[PDB]
Antibody
Framework: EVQLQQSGAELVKPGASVKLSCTAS????????IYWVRQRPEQGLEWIGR????????KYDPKVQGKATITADTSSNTAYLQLSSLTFEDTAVYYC????????????WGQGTSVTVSSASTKGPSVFPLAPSSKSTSGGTAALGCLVKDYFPEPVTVSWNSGALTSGVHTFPAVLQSSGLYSLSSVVTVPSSSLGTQTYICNVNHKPSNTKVDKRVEPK | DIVMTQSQKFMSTSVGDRVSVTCKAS??????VAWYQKKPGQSPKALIY???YRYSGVPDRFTGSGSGTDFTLTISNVQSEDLAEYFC?????????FGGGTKLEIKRTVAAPSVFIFPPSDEQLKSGTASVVCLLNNFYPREAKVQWKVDNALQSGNSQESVTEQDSKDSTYSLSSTLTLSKADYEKHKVYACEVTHQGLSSPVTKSFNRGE
């Protein structure tokens, strides 16, 4: 039905500008108010603004007025959030939200777009297999995974078998290495009996470095 | 500056109990208050509108109440899937404001971790680096200690670890620890081990391998 798809994760320099997109499918946005909110570690969830794509009327939080500009293109069923003069404090996950008005609050949310404001350059991760072995099996179950090492900035997305494998998956929080680069691991437990007939592929996306890797994790 | 204050930053409950999340409005907002549920790694999901009206598909266990400045989200018959952060929000006057959020923690029985170890991949070794990963799966409570030992020598300053959020199905935690050495230092030793201490274990559990099978 209705699905909100936002643009990919970004890494922006201080004082630069970025334009985030929120494309709606399965619903003409002329019947909606489109919202943008951000999430920060301390400030929590913060309302940014709202647009009516039927007429273009916008209502902003006066704290971000001037720095944020929301537009909409009804032809593409897409709303935009333009951020100007980005400061280090603007690092956040930016959500777009859609509401009709009968139940009358943001009932459909996008997946969010992580924006990191930094002067450091992006780095693409290496993806190494964590192969199932006698040292990762017990009780008929086998643990396997992928090590996503040395990247900047967050986030990295990890799926298994293009999303078909979700049970028993653990994608751990990233750790900050001394170099300022991040590392994370993603693991899954599977039957040891079917390691010879099933195929396990971790799909790793790091948008700021255009990294898209499908690593097959083979036993032994 | 209509401030939505949620005084309870965290709340501990058990599967089947009842928990009430409070939301304090600095000004009168009548019943123009909504409640959201933010599961880990997911987008916020709208639970209640108009202070007390649940959404289509929301279970009857989520009940909202309140008027004016005092609001309450009640979760009866708490399920393990209810692990999330719960946010209140007023939409009575611009700018709309959200509460600080309340994290729901679920207490369960003690569970010892399953401990697994992964040698460095051949792919990484050709790159000149060797990472060894120790995995602690599905334990409770969250507190656990991992110690790396190389040739029976306790390691210090060359490892990083992180713990997951509570699992939405069994309320356990998982932990992954990575020991990273240069390939030259890795090939200098033989036995790599992570020693795990946890409340569910009567003695430390050692998971090891010998470099070279």
């Amino acid at each position: 039905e209705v699905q909100l798809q936002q643009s990919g994760a970004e890494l922006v320099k201080p004082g630069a500008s970025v334009k985030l997109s929120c494309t709606a499918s399965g619903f003409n946005i002329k019947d909606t108010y489109i919202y943008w909110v951000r999430q920060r570690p301390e400030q929590g969830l913060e309302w940014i603004g709202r647009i009516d794509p039927a007429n273009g009327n916008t209502k902003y939080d006066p704290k971000v007025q001037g720095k944020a500009t929301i537009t909409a293109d009804t032809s593409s069923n897409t709303a935009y959030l333009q951020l100007s003069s980005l400061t280090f404090e603007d690092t956040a996950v930016y959500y777009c939200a859609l509401e009709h008005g009968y139940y009358d609050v943001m009932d459909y949310w996008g997946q969010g777009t992580s924006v990191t404001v930094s002067s450091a350059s992006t780095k693409g991760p290496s993806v190494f297999p964590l192969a199932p072995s006698s040292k990762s099996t017990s009780g008929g179950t086998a643990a396997l995974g992928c090590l996503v090492k040395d990247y900047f900035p967050e986030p990295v997305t990890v799926s298994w078998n293009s999303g078909a494998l979700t049970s028993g998956v653990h994608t751990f929080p990233a750790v900050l290495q001394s170099s300022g680069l991040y590392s994370l691991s993603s693991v899954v437990t599977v039957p040891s009996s079917s390691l010879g007939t099933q195929t396990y592929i971790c799909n790793v996306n790091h948008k700021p470095s255009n990294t898209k890797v499908d690593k097959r994790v083979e036993p032994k | 500056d209509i401030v939505m204050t949620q005084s309870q930053k965290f709340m501990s409950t058990s599967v089947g109990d009842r928990v009430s999340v409070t939301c304090k409005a600095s000004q009168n907002v009548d019943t123009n208050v909504a409640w959201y549920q933010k599961k880990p790694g997911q987008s916020p999901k709208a639970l209640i509108y108009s202070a007390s009206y649940r959404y289509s598909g929301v279970p009857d266990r989520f009940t909202g109440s309140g008027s004016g400045t005092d609001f309450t989200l009640t979760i009866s018959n708490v399920q393990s899937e209810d692990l999330a952060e719960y946010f209140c929000q007023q939409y009575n006057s611009y700018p709309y404001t959200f509460g600080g959020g309340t994290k729901l923690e679920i207490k369960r029985t003690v569970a010892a971790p399953s401990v697994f170890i992964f040698p460095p991949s051949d792919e990484q070794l050709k790159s000149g680096t060797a990472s060894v990963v120790c995995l602690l799966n599905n334990f409770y409570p969250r507190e656990a200690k991992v110690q790396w030992k190389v040739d029976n020598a306790l390691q210090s300053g060359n490892s990083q670890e992180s713990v997951t959020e509570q699992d939405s199905k069994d309320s356990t935690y998982s932990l992954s620890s990575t020991l990273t050495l240069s390939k030259a230092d890795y090939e200098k030793h033989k036995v790599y081990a992570c020693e795990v201490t946890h409340q569910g274990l009567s003695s430390p559990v050692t998971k090891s391998f010998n470099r070279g099978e």
